Every structure is written in structure tokens, then in C-alpha cells.
Amino acid sequence: EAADVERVYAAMEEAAGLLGVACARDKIYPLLSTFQDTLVEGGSVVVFSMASGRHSTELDFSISVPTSHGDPYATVVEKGLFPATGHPVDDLLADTQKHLPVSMFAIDGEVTGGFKKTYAFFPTDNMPGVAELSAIPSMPPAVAENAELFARYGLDKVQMTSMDYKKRQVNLYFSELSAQTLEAESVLALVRELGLHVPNELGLKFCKRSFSVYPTLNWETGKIDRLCFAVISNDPTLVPSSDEGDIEKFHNYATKAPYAYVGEKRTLVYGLTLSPKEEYYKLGAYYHITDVQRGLLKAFD
Ligand SMILES: CC(C)=CCC/C(C)=C/CSP(=O)(O)OP(=O)(O)O
Numbered sequence: 001e002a003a004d005v006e007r008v009y010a011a012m013e014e015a016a017g018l019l020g021v022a023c024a025r026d027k028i029y030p031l032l033s034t035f036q037d038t039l040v041e042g043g044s045v046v047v048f049s050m051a052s053g054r055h056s057t058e059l060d061f062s063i064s065v066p067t068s069h070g071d072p073y074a075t076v077v078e079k080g081l082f083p084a085t086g087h088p089v090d091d092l093l094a095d096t097q098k099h100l101p102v103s104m105f106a107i108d109g110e111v112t113g114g115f116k117k118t119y120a121f122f123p124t125d126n127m128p129g130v131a132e133l134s135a136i137p138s139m140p141p142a143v144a145e146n147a148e149l150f151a152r153y154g155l156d157k158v159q160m161t162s163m164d165y166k167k168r169q170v171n172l173y174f175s176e177l178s179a180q181t182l183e184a185e186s187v188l189a190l191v192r193e194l195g196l197h198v199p200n201e202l203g204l205k206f207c208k209r210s211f212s213v214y215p216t217l218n219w220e221t222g223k224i225d226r227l228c229f230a231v232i233s234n235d236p237t238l239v240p241s242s243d244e245g246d247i248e249k250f251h252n253y254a255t256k257a258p259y260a261y262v263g264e265k266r267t268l269v270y271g272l273t274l275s276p277k278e279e280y281y282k283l284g285a286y287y288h289i290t291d292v293q294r295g296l297l298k299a300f301d
């Protein structure tokens, strides 16, 4: 429906406007049109995310895509929206759906850059482990090379994976995390092994509240690029930052970002990302939600 495309895009501009970011329609409209059938409210998920520091001048969007519509990356490449990297990443999404059960897909882009990634959701009652994932031919070798470490910290079940075709990186979204894993002692030990920024008390408190944790890996080396802790909540003041600027900006976004599910509070997903020399903050304000998010809020918020 051409109507849904316009509705979604307008909302995207609205979310971007709050951050002072302009949307490149030539890069966005073509993509929304291609997946116009998924933009229908009901069982669709759409998120508009902001980030601090370096990525403060950008705005990302995530749109769920049912598997019934077919491999999303095969679609964008075939439609000439994105060029094949020529690397294993081009086959990872196809191989994943070829080796494991995928319950849903998702496309991810940036308002000025365009399409950049896809997601592969697995059945909650049948999520793969690190072993099954590392077996995928096109999966980064780093996944297998970090299997022991993951097990040592209770990172086993993965609710989904994402592929960034531009940076050639893979995220593993671990789920069903144990309290032990999120303990301050466990978190510090983990970050130290990965050589990442050491979170302070505020950061540690956020980690403990996390419902999901995801490391980013690459095909070049076996070193994890970064690790992100995600918290889902209806609370608009959870940004784990001591910066007056972040406190104000994230709160503004969390209370004004567009959303269609009027009748309920805005679903928000905050992220604390730790990189080798620093940490930055993220916040996804959901424009479309489903029972999945509703269930997560009841369980972790
Ligand atoms: C349910 C849907 C459509 C997906 C939401 C997207 C999601 C889980 C956010 C992770 S992405 P992100 O936090 O931006 O981190 P990076 O790709 O930069 O590593």
C-alpha cells in the first residue's frame, strides 16, 4: 500500500527531525517501496534509533520482514539497491536460513546512508547455540574461536543474528541471560578478556538490567569489535550516561519519537556499547510493536 510507505517515511522524517538529521529520500523511498507489504501495522516491528557521540549525526531504522517475503538481501541486491560485497557476508543470511530455522527477517538502514544490514530471527522455543551458529559455512571464524569464552560467561542461546554488509560485521544477540552473567564481577571479567572499555557503576547497573547482550565480530580477526548491553523499558530516563547533554537529548527523543500504537506507552530499547577505547549510548524508539515486545516488557521491565 502506497499509503503505508508515505506514513512510515513521514514518521521517519519526524524521528530524524528531532535529532536534526535530514533523510535522503532517494535512498529511503526505494527501499520502503520494495518492502511496502511489511509496513502494514499489526505484526510488524519498526524501530527508529539514535546514538551518542560519533553516530549522533545519524538515524537508523529497522523494519521486520516475514520470511514469507523471501531473503531480504537477495531482494535488495537483485533490485540493484545494494552491490554484493563479494565477501562471505553476502551468503551468510542465505546460509543461515539454509542451516537453521528462521522465524522472521529484518532490514536495517540509515536515513542518509540507505540499506546496510539484515537480521535473522530464530524461534524462541528453538534458538540455536554458539555451536550450531559457528557451523554455518559463511559465518565468521571468530564465532567458533570465541565459543569457549562465550560458554564461560553463560552466553549460549541466541535469539537472532544481524549482518552489516558495509562494515562486514556480525552481531550475536544472546538471550535467556542468567543473573550470574550480568553480575558486576562477571561483566568486568568479560570486558577485560575482550579488551573493552571498563563500565563504571552507572554502566554496571544498566548491564545488570539487560535482557540482551550482543558482541560484534568480523571475518578479519578473531577479536570482538565491541559488546552491547540492551535494556527494554517504557521508562524514558534510562540512558546510562553522566553527560548532561545525553541525559536531556535521550529523554527528549524517548518522549517525542513517533509511534502508531497510541493507547500504550512508547516501547524503548536502550543500548550501552563498549568498544576498545570508549563507550557510547543508543536508544531505539519503536514505531511499531508486536506481542513480542509486550512480553519482553512484562518480563524485564
Ligand atoms: C525487531 C527489529 C526489526 C530489530 C531491532 C534492531 C536491533 C535488535 C538493534 C541492534 S542494532 P545496533 O544496536 O544499531 O548495533 P550495531 O548494528 O551498530 O552493531
Ligand SMILES: O=C1C(O)=CC(=O)c2c(O)cc(O)cc21
Pocket: 045, 159, 160, 173, 175, 212, 213, 214, 230, 269, 292, 293, 296
Ligand atoms: O529489540 C528487540 C526486540 O524487539 C525483540 C527481541 O526479541 C530482541 C532480542 O532477543 C535481543 C535484542 O538485542 C533486541 C530485541
Ligand SMILES: [Mg+2]
Pocket: 049, 060
Ligand atoms: Mg543501528
